[PDB]
Amino acid sequence: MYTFVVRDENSSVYAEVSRLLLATGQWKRLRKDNPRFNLMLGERNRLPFGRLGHEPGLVQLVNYYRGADKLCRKASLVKLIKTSPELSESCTWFPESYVIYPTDEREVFLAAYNRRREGREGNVWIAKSSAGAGILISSEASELLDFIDVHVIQKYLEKPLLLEPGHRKFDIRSWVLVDHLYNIYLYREGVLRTSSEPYNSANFQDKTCHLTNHCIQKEYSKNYGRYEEGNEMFFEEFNQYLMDALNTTLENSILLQIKHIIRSCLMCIEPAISTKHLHYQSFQLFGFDFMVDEELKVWLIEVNGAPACAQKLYAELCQGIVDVAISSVFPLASIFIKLHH
Amino acid sequence: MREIVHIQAGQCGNQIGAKFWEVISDEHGIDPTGSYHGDSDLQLERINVYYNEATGNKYVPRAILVDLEPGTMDSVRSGPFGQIFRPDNFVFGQSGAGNNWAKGHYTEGAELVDSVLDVVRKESESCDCLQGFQLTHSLGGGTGSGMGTLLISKIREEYPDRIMNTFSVMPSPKVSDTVVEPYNATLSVHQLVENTDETYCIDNEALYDICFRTLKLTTPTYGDLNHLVSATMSGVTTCLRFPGQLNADLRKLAVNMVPFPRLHFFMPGFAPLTSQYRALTVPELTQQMFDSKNMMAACDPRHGRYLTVAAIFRGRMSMKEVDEQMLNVQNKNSSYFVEWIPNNVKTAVCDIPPRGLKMSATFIGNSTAIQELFKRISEQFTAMFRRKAFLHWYTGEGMDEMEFTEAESNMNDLVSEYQQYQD
Amino acid sequence: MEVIELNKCTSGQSFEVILKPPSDPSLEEIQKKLEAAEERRKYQEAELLKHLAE
Amino acid sequence: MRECISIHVGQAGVQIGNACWELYCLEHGIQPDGQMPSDKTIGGGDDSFNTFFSETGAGKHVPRAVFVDLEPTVIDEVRTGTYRQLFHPEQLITGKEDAANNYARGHYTIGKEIIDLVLDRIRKLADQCTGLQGFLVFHSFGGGTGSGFTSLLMERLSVDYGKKSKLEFSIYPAPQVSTAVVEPYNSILTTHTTLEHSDCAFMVDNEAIYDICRRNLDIERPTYTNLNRLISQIVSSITASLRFDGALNVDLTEFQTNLVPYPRIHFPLATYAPVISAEKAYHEQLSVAEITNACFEPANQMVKCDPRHGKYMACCLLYRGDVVPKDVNAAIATIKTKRSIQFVDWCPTGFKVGINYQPPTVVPGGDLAKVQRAVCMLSNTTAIAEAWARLDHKFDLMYAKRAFVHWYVGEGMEEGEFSEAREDMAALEKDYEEVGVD
Ligand SMILES: Nc1nc2c(ncn2[C@@H]2O[C@H](COP(=O)(O)OP(=O)(O)OP(=O)(O)O)[C@@H](O)[C@H]2O)c(=O)[nH]1
Ligand SMILES: Nc1ncnc2c1ncn2[C@@H]1O[C@H](COP(=O)(O)OP(=O)(O)CP(=O)(O)O)[C@@H](O)[C@H]1O
Ligand SMILES: Nc1nc2c(ncn2[C@@H]2O[C@H](COP(=O)(O)OP(=O)(O)O)[C@@H](O)[C@H]2O)c(=O)[nH]1
Ligand SMILES: [Ca+2]
Ligand SMILES: [Ca+2]
Ligand SMILES: [Ca+2]
Ligand SMILES: [Mg+2]
Ligand SMILES: [Mg+2]
Ligand SMILES: [Mg+2]
């Protein structure tokens, strides 16, 4: 008989994991502030890691990796990619980005902006922050900085891969689970969050065709759900399209770069967040978001530390969390691809 | 040399107290004549907590025997270990108390209390470091209940900075001598709420049920009931009579067990309770120890919450496995332990087991479910008081109905206080 | 790494390694608090004895 | 040569002190009768070991120590123990009834009655010092005497010896061996009234020592003897520089200079390695790099916490045994690349190293095996604040209901001191987060 607590009522993923644990007849849910728990489904902000692993006779496990915010924050991610030799400034799968405060990189961001100005190359950039829904897509630097007045500005992928029919944009969300042993498990089932509006490179003011967000597409797009239900195209349909349209597979053209990017990011911070010899153990579910350009190159946009799953996949994924992440530590009485390292 | 002064008052107090000294005297190797004939120095290392060392290397119990009738005390002086008591420590009258709290507290008892205090003073004056006092008595009678609480009040006045500890037998209609027992118990409980630091609530109803249901005794006698109390008293005082770190004296016990001054009424439990040569594993001791059927208060712990718990394991056993099982009980049923008192369960171990057992476990719980015991008494009290039934026995001794109304309100207050900490 | 302040003796040696450069109450007051606490005790005891006297 | 006086308060401090002074004698070659054959200057001298020992005309080396307990059972064992001949009766001070795990009882009620006697016995040893550095105070957090009487002693010592330094060796409460539910109360009360008066405190969490004993020594149910022997090893590593020839941490002032740039933040984290069970005949002797790498494993720290999620303000390495500077720097280079070591911007990223060639001494028959080389790391990291958070949380849980508060109020202590002490701990936690977080 195992015990667990719930400290994030707004967690759609672990609300299902909690329901599954109880349905096993071998897990007992306690009060949120009862310390004698085996498993903590902790909160997102100010989770007290310092109070974990001090209960004699209790193997305690938490569903978050302390220090993983370095990877799941706009400015943190940029700083971690530029200042880490394992990733280096020469990182070829991350868009050229800069951190600007309303340290600061105002003079560095403009240096590369003038070089592209004279070069006549695509000089469209995007500025975003970790408190967004609000973003600004402009080709003039003066408008980007006046808008910010912490933020980060990176090159806007001007030539993205466009699905047909539709001539539209999209992004790929990958769910990755890391257990207490730091095994990297990539969920087989991904989702393409597509824009139902044709990509118009002339005007960036109308962000319905540029932002593939599920909320922005259901509020500012008239063709929501026209091509696929909920602007969500799963891997089966996307794979067949790439075979019919480009004579290639999702595994070869895209999935190899995604698996590479996932390893590199999680392997980089491993020494800083691993709980191998720690008095408590950690696991965490991550949400990676990629962009695919017209040349079938994959780019990393950001990593979400508290991601939500797709409706159809909630059941399968949540059951997989219990199997490899929870039951592996507390045994009772594959849908993942193990990224070895 | 933290000495404890023992007092036993009334029929029940002296019959239970006599068995207690018979039990612990055997554990420490002392014979009925006061001579030591043991085989372990652990028996003597703290023998002075309860015994005085006399001439010729004789150990004399630091006990004072009090009663308003000579009957029961003549039985003790003629009992097995009757010769071991200090003759000067027998203080008794001739009239009795007629199961009347007023007689023991205001009339008959008042005439005799000064004599008892003179004996207590003599015992305390020769104490190197007096911890306090422990009183055995019932609350249903007249002497132990009425005079016992009078003694406690006068002892506190003369020794305000000493711990007051009592073993108090609560009345039950199942094992009842007279109908006025709820009256006497209600009046005594208020005295205990104010003037004791630790009170082990021993319910004659629980003792009977255990003897009948568990021990399989069809016609339980008081002797059978006193076997349970005798073994329980030895268990709860193990940490006081043998070398140890946890709850080794009365004050440190009180500091660990009493988070609020008035909520100092404990539920004691004992394990095993066999009807007998089988070995009992550490997991088995722990489960029985926490099972309500082994509780002496007749209160369901699952109806309340544990403020604090003191566990004592006796015998040669895996102290590692003891830690494991104890942590297992708390972690398995953490909902029954208040979360605003972290680590409120303390566990001690004593190598010397009780007579006739390879290993045992004594449970001491401060549970809010003890309110069930006080509610029970309060209902029985009110059933008669609403008709002023049997009051003339008390008004004839000078008492006024107001004192009953106040005792009634004091009791219900205590019940309310327990209820506020159960939510 | 920079090693500095190397001191050696028969029983050992010490040194420093730099990986990177950077980027009371008086006795009177105490006596008052100690005696102030003893006063609150005496007051609490006197009240108890007054209660017992009633 | 400047003398140091050790003060052992309460059961924990007395028993730990008894273990340390036993270890000191084995290290300095002092027999149980106080004789020191290797000492050629009879009846005096200003050697390094004289900072902890005085010398009688008869050649006995008497520890500059004082034992204080409000109950005699613990100090009585020292009066009849193996090293009973070292101490004279004036050094052992005992009462009748202890503080009953009640801070207010040790500080106000009972402490007030014995504070002048202890100070008088301390003045005796001080009068025998040509140049007193200060004091090393051993005590527990949870005990009524260790917490209550210690804070009253630290208050007065600042009055009588204002210019002297004071270091603590404090035992953090752990439920696996604790004896009182109110130990969080006593811990926070004593930390509040002792903070201004302590220049540097080494916290030892019984939980960490307990697990190290079970994990690395194979002790199923460790005892105070097991814990104290391991603790005295750590203490010996920290005080060795005061007792032996050397140039690092040679006086008490240097401890504060090398480890405490921020006065309130004066709780360095101690890590020790290796801890090897003597119950195994052969064990691969660890190297300088291996034991140095172990200094960054939480499993070896005196307080379980994660220094990765904090910042360093200073870090010392105290080596004992076969260690040459070349190997230390080679081990630091490797560790610096693999480990996550972050210093505060206003502090240099470096390590003060100290090496004593005499390898660690183990009590004959104990549980710790002899090793060719050992290290104790003293790192002032903000991560140690995790221990304050744990303590403060339990305090908040009980104090919200005023549980057990009546025991303290009944001894003359006012309820306001509880919240006052808690607000002080709240400020302390805020200081740590400012320094070590962004
Ligand atoms: N490491 C270690 N901890 C100890 C030792 N003795 C007691 N403790 C711890 O100290 C705390 C209790 O404080 P004590 O030192 O025993 O109490 P005290 O200082 O004698 O004060 P009193 O309440 O008057 O007895 C508990 O948390 C124990 O775990 C010891 O020998 N070694
Ligand atoms: N450098 C870039 N090039 C092209 N498109 C970009 C881009 N950066 C962001 N976008 C677009 O912006 C959208 C959302 O951006 P982003 O992921 O940074 O914000 P967000 O954190 O609010 C969404 P989520 O938290 O669900 O991942 C993406 O769907 C992507 O299409
Ligand atoms: N357990 C137990 N209870 C007793 C014994 N004798 C009396 N009682 C209980 O005590 C109450 C009567 O009090 P008693 O001690 O006889 O009156 P007293 O002599 O005036 O103090 C009743 O509730 C009885 O059930 C006994 O030997 N054992
Ligand atoms: Ca008369
Ligand atoms: Ca000399
Ligand atoms: Ca000072
Ligand atoms: Mg986001
Ligand atoms: Mg009777
Ligand atoms: Mg003590």
Report the alpha-carbon distance of residue B127 to residue B147 in Å, rounded.
25
CB nearest C11 (choices: D112, D358, D413): D358
Q: Which residues of D162-174 are buried (b: 16+ CB within 10 A; e: fewer)?
A: eebbbbbbbbbbb
Query: For residue A125, is it within any domain?
Result: no
How many CB pairs below 8 A link C and D? 107
C-alpha angle A16-A17-A18 in degrees, rounded to nearest 5? 90
The CATH number of the domain holding residue A57 is 3.40.50.11480
Which 3-state string (H, E, C) describes B294-361?
HECCCCCHHHCCEEEEEEEEEECCCHHHHHHHHHHHHHHCHHHECCCCCCCEEEEEECCCCCCCCEEE
Which atom of ligand 3 lies at the shortest distance from residue B202's CA?
Answer: 1
User: In chain C, what is the greatest distance between 2 CA atoms, to the nearest angstrom?
Assistant: 81
Instruction: Collect all residues of chain D within an 8 Å Cβ-Cβ radius of residue C11.
Output: 244-246, 356-358
Cβ atoms within 10 A of the Cβ of A218, count? 13
List the end-to-end C-alpha distance of chain B, in Å, as a whole number.
Answer: 42
| CATH 3.30.1330.20 placement within chain D | 269-386
Residue B120 phi/psi, 5° resolution? -60, -45
Distance D127 CA to ligand 6 centre (A): 20
By what method was this entry solved? X-ray
Nearest Cα residue in chain A from B328:
A57
Tokens at D373, concatenated: 């080389």
Of A62, A84, A112, which one is at a domain's C-terminal end? A62
Q: How many helices (H) and strands (E) does chain A have?
A: 9, 16
Cβ atoms within 10 A of the Cβ of B4, count? 23
Q: Do B341 and D181 touch (CB under 8 A)?
A: yes
Based on the domain organization, do A52 and A165 belong to the same domain? no
| CATH 1.10.287.600 placement within chain B | 371-422
Burial of D81 (0-12, 13-18, 19+ CB in 10 A): middle
Q: Is D254 a catalytic residue?
A: yes
CATH number of B265-370: 3.30.1330.20
> Whose atoms come closest to the Cα of A170: which ligand?
2
Distance from CA of C18 to the nearest CA of D (A): 4
Around D390, how many Cα atoms within 13 Å sit in the side-chain half-sphere? 23
Q: Residue B134's beta-bridge partner residues?
A: B6, B165
Query: For residue A263, is it within any domain?
Result: yes
Report whether the peptide linkage leading into residue D274 is cis, meaning its omega lies within 30 degrees of zero.
yes
Instruction: For tokens 């890590």, name the residue.
Output: D271
For domain D269-386, the question of CATH label 3.40.50.300 is answered with no
Q: Which range of residues forms the domain containing residue A166?
A: 69-71+161-339
Q: Where are the beta strands (DSSP E) in chain A?
A: 2-6, 27-29, 39-41, 61-62, 97-100, 125-128, 136-138, 151-155, 168-178, 184-187, 191-198, 232-234, 281-282, 284-292, 298-304, 336-339
Question: What's the number of domains chain A is made of?
Answer: 2
Is B204 labelled as part of a ligand binding site? yes
Resolution in A: 2.3
Instruction: Collect all residues of chain A within an 8 Å Cβ-Cβ radius of residue D305.
Output: 50
Q: How many helices (H) and strands (E) does chain B have?
A: 15, 12
70-89 in chain B: CB under 8 A from chain A: none
Q: Which CATH superfamily is domain D3-259 in?
A: Tubulin/FtsZ, GTPase domain (3.40.50.1440)
The CATH number of the domain holding residue A328 is 3.30.470.20
Query: For residue A136, is it within any domain?
Result: no
C-alpha distances in angstroms, D378 versus A184, D238, D239, D249?
Answer: 35, 8, 12, 11
Report the alpha-carbon distance of residue D95 to residue B100 in Å, rounded.
45
CB nearest D100 (choices: B245, B251, B260): B251
Q: Which CATH superfamily is domain B371-422 in?
A: Helix hairpin bin (1.10.287.600)
Tokens at D52, concatenated: 């902890």
Query: Is A56 an 8 Å CB contact of chain D?
Result: yes
> Whose atoms come closest to the Cα of B140: which ligand?
3
Of A35, A62, A89, which one is at a domain's C-terminal end? A62
Q: Using CB atoms, which chains have 3+ pairs under 8 A with D?
A: A, B, C
Active-site residue, from D27, D155, D254, D429: D254
DSSP 8-state assignment for residue D169: E
Query: Is A243 an 8 Å CB contact of chain D?
Result: no
CATH number of B2-257: 3.40.50.1440
Query: For residue A224, is it within any domain?
Result: yes
Q: Do D340 and A51 touch (CB under 8 A)?
A: no
Distance B131 CA to ligand 9 centre (A): 15
| CATH 3.30.1330.20 placement within chain B | 265-370
Which 3-state string (H, E, C) describes A256-267?
HHHHHHHHHHHH
Name the residue among A68, A278, A271 with its Cα closest to residue D341: A271
Q: Residue D270's beta-bridge partner residues?
A: D378
Query: For residue A225, is it within any domain?
Result: yes
Determine contact, residues A97/A109, Cβ cutoff 8 Å.
Answer: no
Is B142 labelled as part of a ligand binding site? yes
Is residue B171 within 6 Å of ligand 3 at its C-beta?
yes
Determine contact, residues A18/A313, Cβ cutoff 8 Å.
Answer: no
Report the alpha-carbon distance of residue D171 to residue D231 in Å, rounded.
10
Is residue B377 within 6 Å of ligand 3 at its C-beta?
no
Is residue B204 within 6 Å of ligand 3 at its C-beta?
yes
Chain B interface, best mutation among A30, A36, A38, by max B CB count within 10 A: A36
Report the alpha-carbon distance of residue B146 to residue B156 in Å, rounded.
16
Report the alpha-carbon distance of residue A162 to residue A156 in Å, rounded.
15
Distance D131 CA to ligand 6 centre (A): 17
Name the residue among A263, A238, A270, A265 with its Cα closest to residue A251: A238
> Whose atoms come closest to the Cα of B107: which ligand?
4
For ligand 5, a single-atom ion, which residues have Cβ within 5 Å?
Answer: D 39, 41, 45
Distance from CA of A1 to the nearest CA of D (A): 23
Report the alpha-carbon distance of residue D333 to residue D348 in Å, rounded.
16
- Going by DSSP bridges, is the β-strand pair A125-128/A39-41 parallel, antiparallel, or unpaired? unpaired
